[PDB]
Amino acid sequence: RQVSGDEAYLEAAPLAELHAPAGMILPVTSGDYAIPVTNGSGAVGKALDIRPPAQP
């Protein structure tokens, strides 16, 4: 059984760059699975109208 108007994904743990020690470096981040910041005023979950647009 499947997600109808769910909102559980909002509680998902945030992302924070791991601070590296001195005399050591963290492995090289593959460009894959990387999210660009977007000045986003759009709603989320149930608050977002996911109905198809129209015109005229």
Partner 1 sequence: ERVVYRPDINQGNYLTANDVSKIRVGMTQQQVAYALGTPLMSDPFGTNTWFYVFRQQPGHEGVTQQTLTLTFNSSGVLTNIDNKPALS
Partner 2 sequence: EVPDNPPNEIYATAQQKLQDGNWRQAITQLEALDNRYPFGPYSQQVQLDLIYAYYKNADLPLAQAAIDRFIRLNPTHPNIDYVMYMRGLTNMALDDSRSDRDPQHARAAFSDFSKLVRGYPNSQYTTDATKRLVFLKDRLAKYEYSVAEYYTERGAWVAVVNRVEGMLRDYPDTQATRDALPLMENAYRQMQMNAQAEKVAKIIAANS
- Chain residues binding partner 1 by CB under 8 A are 24-28
Interacting partner of 25 out of partner 2, partner 1, none (Cβ under 5 to 8 A depending on kind): partner 1
Smallest gap from residue 18 Cβ to partner 1 (A) = 12
User: Which one, 10 or 26, has the nearer CB to partner 1?
Assistant: 26
Minimum distance from residue 17 beta carbon to partner 1 (Å): 16
Residues 6+ apart with CB under 8 A from 41: none
Provide the strand spans (E) within the chain.
none
Q: Please state the φ and ψ torsions of residue 2, each to the nearest 5 degrees.
A: -140, 160
